[PDB]
């Protein structure tokens, strides 16, 4: 392949997994921001391997997961020339993150982005509800418009990212009504992704050669960590009350007070990068897919140097008191 640079730093999802209309209406991908890498102790459950029922130490990558919010939908009708959106539907109240995304000079603009669109709910909704019933009627496939809570993130960019997600639940009408309830509300990955899920990662890699869109597939999610948990770094074996945040935090990133996904292996791109987490394009059954992993211990030490503790309470407990 000719190595030309990426178009956008938010990499495109060129293909989505297959629509099952017998499952409830649910998302198919997510956009998070990778914090960094650490090392996880767990037990291997692999008969046929000599390392069966044996402690393995594994490199993982953790992506910060702010809860994503839906602000619009887009229905595509089939043409003999390809997919084409007949329209897009927006919600009324959109944040300055998203109105910032449309603008290049937000700091001096009069911020006039979706003003007259807000007059479209000043009415009963007749044009808007006509459009919703149109996307019920036409537009065989449905994509939803989502953006992240980037202010809840140590990113210096206050401008959140918008993306489309193909909605592979059932019933296009129930899909657009589902999105209609889910306008301006939130969706966490706990209703979308789960433990042991084989996911694919779509991300622009590290420029220096580089800065190319890459899709690395078949990565087992190891932890769907909740933001309210203070035992994010804990296990049933590791009974410390500690977070997933490293000692000193993630290097050049900040922290994760939000939800997070800890996934096996490595991933294209660097830290501070927008990464799409897509579920698998097929039902992998490789027994590397079916594995219900069970963690044991989480490294949360410093990568800012050769770390030697996990909690600072452990640090004071070993070092005792100081002169300071």
């Amino acid at each position: 392949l000719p190595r030309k640079r990426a178009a956008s730093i938010r990499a495109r999802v060129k293909a989505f997994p297959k629509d099952d209309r017998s499952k409830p209406v649910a998302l198919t991908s997510f956009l998070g921001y990778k914090a960094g890498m650490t090392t996880i102790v767990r037990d291997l459950d692999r008969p046929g391997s000599k390392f069966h029922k044996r402690e393995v130490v594994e490199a993982v990558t953790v992506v910060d997961t702010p809860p994503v919010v839906v602000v619009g939908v887009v229905g595509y009708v089939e043409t003999p020339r390809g997919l084409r959106s007949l329209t897009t539907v927006w919600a009324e109240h959109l944040s300055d993150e998203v109105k910032r995304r449309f603008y290049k000079n937000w700091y001096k603009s009069k911020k006039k982005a979706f003003t007259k669109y807000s007059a479209k709910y000043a009415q009963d909704g007749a044009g808007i509800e006509r459009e919703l019933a149109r996307i019920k009627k036409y537009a065989s496939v449905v994509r939803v418009l989502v953006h992240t809570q980037i202010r809840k993130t140590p990113l210096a960019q206050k401008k959140a990212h918008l993306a489309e997600i193909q909605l592979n639940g059932g019933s296009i009408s129930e899909k657009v009504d589902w999105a209609r309830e889910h306008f301006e509300k939130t969706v966490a990955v706990d209703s979308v992704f789960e433990q042991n899920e084989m996911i694919d990662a779509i991300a622009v890699t590290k420029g220096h050669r580089g800065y190319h869109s890459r899709t690395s597939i078949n990565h087992k999610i190891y932890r769907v960590g909740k933001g309210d948990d203070e035992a994010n770094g804990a296990t049933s074996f590791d009974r410390t009350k500690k977070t997933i945040t490293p000692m000193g935090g993630f290097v050049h990133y900040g922290e994760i007070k939000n939800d997070f996904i800890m996934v096996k292996g490595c991933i294209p791109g660097n830290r501070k990068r927008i990464v799409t987490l897509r579920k698998s394009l097929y039902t992998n059954t490789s027994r590397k897919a079916l594995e219900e992993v069970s963690l044991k211990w989480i490294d949360t030490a410093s990568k800012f140097g050769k770390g030697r503790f996990q909690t600072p309470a452990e640090k004071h407990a070993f070092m005792g008191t100081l002169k300071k």
């Binding site: 090392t39 102790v41 402690e55 130490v57 009974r239 211990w297 490294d299 030490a301 050769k306 770390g307 030697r308 503790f309 996990q310 452990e314 004071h316 407990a317 070993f318 005792g320 008191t321």
Partner: protein
């Protein structure tokens, strides 16, 4: 399983530190390559002031406590009792609290005597003139 550093006494973890094994099958774990290269040069941790051979040999901290009677490697295993588990958890948390309290109060003995010797030494800078 947590082991100590051979050179720091610091807790060694998976992925952390290098082990050396002599011909007499004695494993020595080091939390970092500073400890490991310090062992390579045949050095004494009683010479290096920061490591706990010097600090437990020196008297900066207390080194024997009645709280230390609980932490010991036991070669005879015990059958599983679920009801002892949470009691051991409460024991570990409580005893670590008591250990930090005794260590800080042991350091509280150190700072009072400098008042007395500063009194006795500033009397010498007054009473001669």
């Amino acid at each position: 399983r947590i082991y100590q550093c051979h050179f720091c006494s610091s807790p060694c973890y998976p992925g952390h530190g290098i082990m050396f094994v002599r011909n007499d099958a004695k494993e020595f774990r080091f939390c970092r390559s500073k400890c490991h290269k310090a062992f390579k040069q045949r050095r004494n941790p009683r010479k290096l002031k920061w490591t706990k051979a010097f600090r437990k040999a020196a008297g900066k901290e207390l080194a024997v406590d009645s709280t230390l009677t609980f932490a010991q490697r036991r070669n005879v295993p015990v059958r599983y009792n679920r009801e002892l588990v949470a009691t051991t958890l409460k024991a570990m948390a409580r005893i670590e609290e008591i250990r930090q309290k005794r260590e800080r109060a042991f350091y509280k003995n150190r700072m009072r005597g400098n008042k007395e010797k500063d009194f006795l030494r500033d009397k010498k800078l007054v009473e001669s003139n």
